[PDB]
Design a binder for this molecule. Structure first.
Ligand code: K
Length: 400
């Protein structure tokens, strides 16, 4: 059972808190950040009930119940940005703080936008940082110009705030934004975009039962393992035809290679057929899964050419070069260009993978290790960047 998407869980917790009615979140990610979010909601006077499978939140359209509170945001970036936003739309006096390490991560574009919008927010130490104090009296709404051309969480916080304002928002400023808008639609709000302005209406949200998708990028490694293994089947419940995450599109590549791929309404099944046919794939819009394909290409029937992936070179490591370097260490011939990589299938020999600290390099070449004995990693712990239990889950897949 693969973990829920962190960024989808974060947005869903905000929506569950802010909506009119009782929202049920199905399979949310349980992390230290989401645990602190839930704890902060309870401190603010929201009712939060939980089982191992579902969280239940009584929405508060007018914000926190308590008139005053001290809220500790722990180490969680979502908690540190979304809870002050929720509180700012309510009515009371709220003193926020974070761990000494999280205090070092400011949120100035968001706090500047809230103050532009009339919120009495005060930074107690440096501008932009926790600790900060919100003397909340709702948000009127209207125009605001956000200067967040970097982190995506600030625009998403303002979008999520919009329906809690009295007049709506006109926010003047990416896959991340389309996911936020689709989730707001599931909670009953349509957002319109006019040029550089997002036009968000007032009137609040409608509570619902909302299932959190498993991380689809994490799912790509388990789908690939099945496509590589004749007769093996992997199903991921919660990734279906209406899925918000673009990286589910990786399975359409696996189908083109000859795997049996069934994308159902509520689940996706990949079954290996023994046929793994070479192809050219434009992976511009699913580029986080480019390494997943590079790592099974040694076993294809013909060259695998991955095109339009300039974006993979400018991650924290050049993932195009890292894939080529590791494939060559395994004995595989590889050619590269400015924005493409071409992998020529043939026998491979185990070696230590140079990860560059990149979680996707480790997870991708783990799949290669199903068929090539003696693959190890210089940095196996870097998978914790997105999936702390990856090595356990993949070991379980191997045994099955
Ligand atoms: K103002």
């Amino acid at each position: 059972s693969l973990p829920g998407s962190k960024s989808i869980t974060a947005r869903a917790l905000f929506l569950a808190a802010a909506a009119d009615g009782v929202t049920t979140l199905v399979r949310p990610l349980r992390s230290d950040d989401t645990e602190g979010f839930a704890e902060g909601l309870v401190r603010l006077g929201y009712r939060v009930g939980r089982t191992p499978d579902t969280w239940q939140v009584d929405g508060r359209p007018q914000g926190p119940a308590v008139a005053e509170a001290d809220v500790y945001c722990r180490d969680g970036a979502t908690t540190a940005r979304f809870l002050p936003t929720l509180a700012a739309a309510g009515h009371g006096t709220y003193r926020f703080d974070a761990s000494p390490q999280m205090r070092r991560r400011p949120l100035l574009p968001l706090s500047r936008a809230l103050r532009d919008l009339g919120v009495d927010l005060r930074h107690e130490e440096a501008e932009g940082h926790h600790p900060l104090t919100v003397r909340a009296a709702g948000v009127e709404g209207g125009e605001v110009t956000l200067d967040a051309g970097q982190s995506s969480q600030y625009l998403t916080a303002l979008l999520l705030l919009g329906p809690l304002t009295r007049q709506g928002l006109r926010i003047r400023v990416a896959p991340y934004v389309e996911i936020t808008l689709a989730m707001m639609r599931a909670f009953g709000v349509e957002v319109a975009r006019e040029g550089d302005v997002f036009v968000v209406p007032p009137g609040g949200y409608r509570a619902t039962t909302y299932a959190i998708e498993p991380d689809a990028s994490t799912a790509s490694y388990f789908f690939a393992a099945a496509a590589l293994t004749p007769g093996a089947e992997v199903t991921v419940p919660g990734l279906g035809t209406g899925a918000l995450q673009g990286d589910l599109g990786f399975v359409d590549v696996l189908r083109r290679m000859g795997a049996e791929v069934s994308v159902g309404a509520d689940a996706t099944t990949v079954r290996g057929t023994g046929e793994l046919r070479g192809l050219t794939a434009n992976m511009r819009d699913i580029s986080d899964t480019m390494p997943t394909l590079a790592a099974i290409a040694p076993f294809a029937s013909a060259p695998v050419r991955i095109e339009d992936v300039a974006n993979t070179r400018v991650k924290e490591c050049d993932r195009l070069e890292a894939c080529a370097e590791n494939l060559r260490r395994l004995g595989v011939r590889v050619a590269t260009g400015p924005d493409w990589i071409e992998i020529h299938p043939g026998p491979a020999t185990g070696a230590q993978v140079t990860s560059y600290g990149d979680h996707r390099i480790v997870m991708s070449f783990a799949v290669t290790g199903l068929r090539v004995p003696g693959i190890s990693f210089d940095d196996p712990g870097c998978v914790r960047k997105t999936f702390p239990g990856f090595h356990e889950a993949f070991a379980e897949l191997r045994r099955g």
